[PDB]
Amino acid sequence: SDFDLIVVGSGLFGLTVAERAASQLGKKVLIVEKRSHLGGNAYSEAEPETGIEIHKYGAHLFHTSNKRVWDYVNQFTAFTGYQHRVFAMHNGTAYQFPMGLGLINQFFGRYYTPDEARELIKEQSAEIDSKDATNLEEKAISLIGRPLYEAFIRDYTAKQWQTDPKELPAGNITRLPVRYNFDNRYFNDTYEGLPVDGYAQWLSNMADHENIEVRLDTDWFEVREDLRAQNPEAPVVYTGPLDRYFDYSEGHLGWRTLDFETEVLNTGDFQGTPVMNYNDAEFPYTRIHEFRHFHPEREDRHPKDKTVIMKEYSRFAEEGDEPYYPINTPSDREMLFKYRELADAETESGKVYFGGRLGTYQYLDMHMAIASALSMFDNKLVDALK
Amino acid sequence: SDFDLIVVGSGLFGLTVAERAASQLGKKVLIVEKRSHLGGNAYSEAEPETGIEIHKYGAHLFHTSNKRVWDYVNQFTAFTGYQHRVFAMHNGTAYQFPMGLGLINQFFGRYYTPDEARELIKEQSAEIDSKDATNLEEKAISLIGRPLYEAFIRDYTAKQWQTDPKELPAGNITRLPVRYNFDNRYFNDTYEGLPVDGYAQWLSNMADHENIEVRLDTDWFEVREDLRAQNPEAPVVYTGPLDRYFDYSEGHLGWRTLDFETEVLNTGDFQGTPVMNYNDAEFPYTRIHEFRHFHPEREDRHPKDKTVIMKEYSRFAEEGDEPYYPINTPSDREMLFKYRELADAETESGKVYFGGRLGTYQYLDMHMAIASALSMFDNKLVDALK
Numbered sequence: 107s108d109f110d111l112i113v114v115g116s117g118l119f120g121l122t123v124a125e126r127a128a129s130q131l132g133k134k135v136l137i138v139e140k141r142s143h144l145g146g147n148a149y150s151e152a153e154p155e156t157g158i159e160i161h162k163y164g165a166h167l168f169h170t171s172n173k174r175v176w177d178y179v180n181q182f183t184a185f186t187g188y189q190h191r192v193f194a195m196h197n198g199t200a201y202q203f204p205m206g207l208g209l210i211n212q213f214f215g216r217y218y219t220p221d222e223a224r225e226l227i228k229e230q231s232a233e234i235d236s237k238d239a240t241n242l243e244e245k246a247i248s249l250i251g252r253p254l255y256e257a258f259i260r261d262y263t264a265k266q267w268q269t270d271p272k273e274l275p276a277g278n279i280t281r282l283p284v285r286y287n288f289d290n291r292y293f294n295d296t297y298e299g300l301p302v303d304g305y306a307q308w309l310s311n312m313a314d315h316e317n318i319e320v321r322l323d324t325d326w327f328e329v330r331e332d333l334r335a336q337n338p339e340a341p342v343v344y345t346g347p348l349d350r351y352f353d354y355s356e357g358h359l360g361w362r363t364l365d366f367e368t369e370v371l372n373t374g375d376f377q378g379t380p381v382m383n384y385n386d387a388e389f390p391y392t393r394i395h396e397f398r399h400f401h402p403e404r405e406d407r408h409p410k411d412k413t414v415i416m417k418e419y420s421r422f423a424e425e426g427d428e429p430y431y432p433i434n435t436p437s438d439r440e441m442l443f444k445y446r447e448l449a450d451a452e453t454e455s456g457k458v459y460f461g462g463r464l465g466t467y468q469y470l471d472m473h474m475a476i477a478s479a480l481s482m483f484d485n486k487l488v489d490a491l492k
Numbered sequence: 493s494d495f496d497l498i499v500v501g502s503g504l505f506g507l508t509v510a511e512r513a514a515s516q517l518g519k520k521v522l523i524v525e526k527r528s529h530l531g532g533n534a535y536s537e538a539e540p541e542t543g544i545e546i547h548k549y550g551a552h553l554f555h556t557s558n559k560r561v562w563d564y565v566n567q568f569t570a571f572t573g574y575q576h577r578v579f580a581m582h583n584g585t586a587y588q589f590p591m592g593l594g595l596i597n598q599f600f601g602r603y604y605t606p607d608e609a610r611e612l613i614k615e616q617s618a619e620i621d622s623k624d625a626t627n628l629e630e631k632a633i634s635l636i637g638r639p640l641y642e643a644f645i646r647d648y649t650a651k652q653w654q655t656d657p658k659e660l661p662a663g664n665i666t667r668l669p670v671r672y673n674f675d676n677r678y679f680n681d682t683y684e685g686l687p688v689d690g691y692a693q694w695l696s697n698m699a700d701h702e703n704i705e706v707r708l709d710t711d712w713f714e715v716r717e718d719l720r721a722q723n724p725e726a727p728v729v730y731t732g733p734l735d736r737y738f739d740y741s742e743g744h745l746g747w748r749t750l751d752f753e754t755e756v757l758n759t760g761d762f763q764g765t766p767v768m769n770y771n772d773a774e775f776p777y778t779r780i781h782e783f784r785h786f787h788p789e790r791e792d793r794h795p796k797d798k799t800v801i802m803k804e805y806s807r808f809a810e811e812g813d814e815p816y817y818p819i820n821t822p823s824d825r826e827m828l829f830k831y832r833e834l835a836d837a838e839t840e841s842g843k844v845y846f847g848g849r850l851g852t853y854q855y856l857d858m859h860m861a862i863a864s865a866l867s868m869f870d871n872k873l874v875d876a877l878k
């Protein structure tokens with residue numbers, strides 16, 4: 107045959123399945139991508155004026171504690187030593203973030219020792235006992251007290267979800283969001299970096315294999331009947347939207363979406379940090395990304411007096427809008443379960459496997475998506491191709 | 493012969509010369525060390541109560557941009573991903589440090605953009621033009637203005653050197669000590685970490701070679717005549733004090749020294765950070781080290797409710813006191829030049845080479861000492877052993 111496996115979508119999930127089928131099983135793999143770009147939502151391109159790499163489906167920071175995933179991805183790209191750090195803008199002051207001795211000092215007026223800060227939090231937060239909390243405002247106040255909650259969580263949360271926290275589920279905060287030290291590494295994982303030649307280069311390296319064919323600008327649903335006819339017993343890994351597959355015959359799954367306002371400013375440095383969170387209602391956006399700071403090892407390939415920034419706005423998805431974060435109304439988790447049994451059946455009668463962010467209505471970190479793909483490869487696909 | 497080379501001192505300089513002679517030239521090397529420990533001032537041992545590694549001749553942070561040095565030392569030890577960060581304690585508040593947008597925000601009341609902060613510094617510092625500065629207070633004020641200088645440099649400098657900055661040389665500040673971003677990595681070098689199994693283990697690995705013999709608790713000056721008699725044409729690399737070699741016959745070289753007050757506290761976390769600078773006169777010490785934070789990858793080999801800390805005090809050296817930092821009175825740089833010509837002669841008539849921190853009256857970072865030793869090996873010693 108001309109191909110042995112069809113993969114719909116060229117994000118990390120698709121690409122991982124493809125590469126494994128190509129290099130481990132030696133099978134011919136055809137990848138079908140709707141967009142014009144390879145790589146799915148992880149994709150990055152250079153802003154044309156300045157040459158600075160930007161991620162146009164949200165900022166992507168790579169971090170994992172999963173050694174298997176880590177060793178795997180280093181086959182296709184090297185990573186930088188970048189460590190993510192975030193600052194939080196509130197009443198005209200940039201606060202160290204997340205909440206630790208750093209933020210505590212700045213906010214409450216003076217230095218607190220680690221022990222002094224445990225006690226400070228104990229008092230602030232005793233207003234509400236945690237097991238007796240009904241909504242999100244309460245749950246949070248119950249863990250860190252009102253002053254911190256109202257300055258750093260309330261407006262920020264309300265912007266991300268377009269809703270008063272009192273109207274939000276208590277189960278959304280699960281651990282204490284405070285560190286009793288000055289460690290402001292944003293992520294606690296073992297391995298962390300950015301792809302040295304950018305994301306596009308990395309994703310593209312995954313598809314660079316003699317056994318892999320890629321057709322950009324191709325909707326699966328326009329070509330599926332043609333292609334499966336060329337080899338009826340070739341299996342399909344579908345990573346597109348789960349509901350759209352079954353023609354929304356159980357109702358539309360509900361997504362939160364993001365609008366990205368991208369400007370080129372005539373300064374070399376707009377905020378001297380990669381990401382600045384804005385925690386006050388006065389500002390429409392949740393945060394501002396300044397992409398040159400994601401790659402400071404490039405400062406002599408970057409414009410001296412220009413910089414690209416990008417403000418992030420949050421809201422709900424009308425159709426046409428990109429799906430980003432699953433909403434998970436319980437009404438949503440409902441039409442999900444019914445779709446999972448549609449998929450399972452479809453898998454058993456049509457050899458069509460469902461994976462990835464869109465295909466399973468699940469949020470996945472990159473390393474999680476890659477691990478999920480490696481799982482499906484070993485556990486379902488190796489048998490399917492014998 | 494029983495040995496081909498004699499090395500006095502087992503610090504990084506000595507050890508580097510020894511290891512190179514042993515492994516590259518195949519020569520037998522005898523190392524003579526006055527102390528009971530191997531490793532010189534880089535040495536670390538476990539505090540006995542808690543098991544936490546402490547460095548008992550000052551905190552040692554390893555950092556270099558010298559790839560050759562870096563590749564070399566990784567032969568004897570692996571390094572952690574530790575990145576050094578420092579905070580500065582002033583009027584009961586822990587300030588982000590060194591001076592950047594972080595400290596500027598906290599000190600002046602609100603956030604300044606990178607451009608806004610260049611302008612802020614331009615105004616504060618225009619009180620004095622830099623070329624017209626006479627002492628250290630002026631030079632500093634000339635670069636960052638009085639408010640910053642008086643809050644973060646004056647008392648701190650005065651403690652380190654026991655002297656009013658107005659009585660200190662203007663040439664001691666050479667670049668602008670401010671960053672116009674939020675990057676608070678303390679060091680700007682390419683490679684940085686701490687030896688994974690501690691310093692003792694690393695230094696000891698350098699001397700672990702079939703061709704190297706080590707005699708601890710041995711003063712060179714008590715055994716030199718005996719040893720050189722066993723093989724008169726074996727060369728000597730001396731890394732002891734330069735003046736003491738020539739019986740202070742040109743006067744005593746002047747050193748600054750350090751006293752180290754080490755306590756074991758009954759808490760698991762005293763300040764939630766490795767190093768806290770104290771910038772106010774109210775406090776005798778320049779800073780407090782809390783050693784568990786140097787190695788957080790060990791948190792499950794560390795006491796849960798005990799921690800070792802160590803306050804650092806500065807002053808001048810009486811004899812008996814350890815030499816740490818060269819003072820360099822011009823009266824000092826004077827008796828130096830005369831000692832260099834004593835050494836050169838002694839090198840030519842006695843095959844006795846002078847290197848390292850003490851032997852050259854020079855301050856050396858670890859990587860600088862190692863590079864200086866590798867230099868002397870290739871350029872002077874390879875010939876000397878043929």
Ligand SMILES: Cc1cc2c(cc1C)N(C[C@H](O)[C@H](O)[C@H](O)COP(=O)(O)OP(=O)(O)OC[C@H]1O[C@@H](n3cnc4c(N)ncnc43)[C@H](O)[C@@H]1O)c1[nH]c(=O)[nH]c(=O)c1N2
Pocket residue numbers: 114115116117118119120138139140141145146147148163164165166167168169324325326327345346347364430431461462463464470471472473475
């Ligand atoms: C805003 C935001 C920010 C981040 C992140 C997500 C989001 C939403 N990510 C997560 C990351 O985006 C995620 O892990 C990957 O997108 C998952 O890759 P998938 O293959 O599962 O889907 P993905 O969406 O990437 O790929 C699906 C592909 O299928 C294509 N397709 C869809 N329908 C099709 C059809 N009918 N026919 C053909 N092609 C079709 C799409 O065009 C797309 O190329 C992240 N993770 C992390 O670890 N760190 C981070 O910092 C971030 N940042």
Ligand SMILES: Cc1cc2c(cc1C)N(C[C@H](O)[C@H](O)[C@H](O)COP(=O)(O)OP(=O)(O)OC[C@H]1O[C@@H](n3cnc4c(N)ncnc43)[C@H](O)[C@@H]1O)c1[nH]c(=O)[nH]c(=O)c1N2
Pocket residue numbers: 500501502503504505506524525526527531532533534549550551552553554555710711712713731732733750816817847848849850856857858859861
């Ligand atoms: C307070 C402080 C703090 C730091 C540092 C220095 C100081 C003073 N260092 C620098 C580091 O200490 C330095 O690079 C090494 O000590 C240099 O090693 P040497 O071999 O040159 O001398 P070093 O002093 O280490 O070795 C000399 C050896 O010779 C022995 N000796 C002397 N006289 C003798 C005699 N008569 N007979 C026999 N043996 C004799 C001594 O006992 C000693 O073991 C540092 N660097 C860095 O890169 N990062 C850091 O963070 C620090 N921190």
Ligand SMILES: CC(=O)N[C@H]1[C@@H](OP(=O)(O)OP(=O)(O)OC[C@H]2O[C@@H](n3ccc(=O)[nH]c3=O)[C@H](O)[C@@H]2O)O[C@H](CO)[C@@H](O)[C@@H]1O
Pocket residue numbers: 194258259260262263266383385469471
């Ligand atoms: C809850 C959720 O889906 N979190 C995701 C989010 O985290 P990410 O690190 O991007 O952080 P967010 O800005 O989305 O914060 C998540 C939540 O934390 C709270 N918050 C956060 C920051 C702040 O300044 N103030 C504040 O209150 C809010 O309730 C907010 O809804 O994106 C990551 C990368 O795409 C994902 O790995 C996470 O799973």
Ligand SMILES: CC(=O)N[C@H]1[C@@H](OP(=O)(O)OP(=O)(O)OC[C@H]2O[C@@H](n3ccc(=O)[nH]c3=O)[C@H](O)[C@@H]2O)O[C@H](CO)[C@@H](O)[C@@H]1O
Pocket residue numbers: 580644645646648649652769771855857
């Ligand atoms: C001038 C000098 O010998 N510096 C050494 C010092 O730097 P190190 O990083 O240890 O910094 P220090 O605390 O010794 O500061 C050096 C000087 O900077 C100024 N200062 C520093 C910190 C602060 O909070 N406020 C302030 O004003 C003072 O004038 C001080 O004398 O030890 C390092 C490691 O042992 C050496 O690599 C450096 O060469």
Ligand code: NA
Pocket residue numbers: 231232233234235236247248249
């Ligand atoms: Na509580």
Ligand code: NA
Pocket residue numbers: 617618619620621622633634635
């Ligand atoms: Na000036």
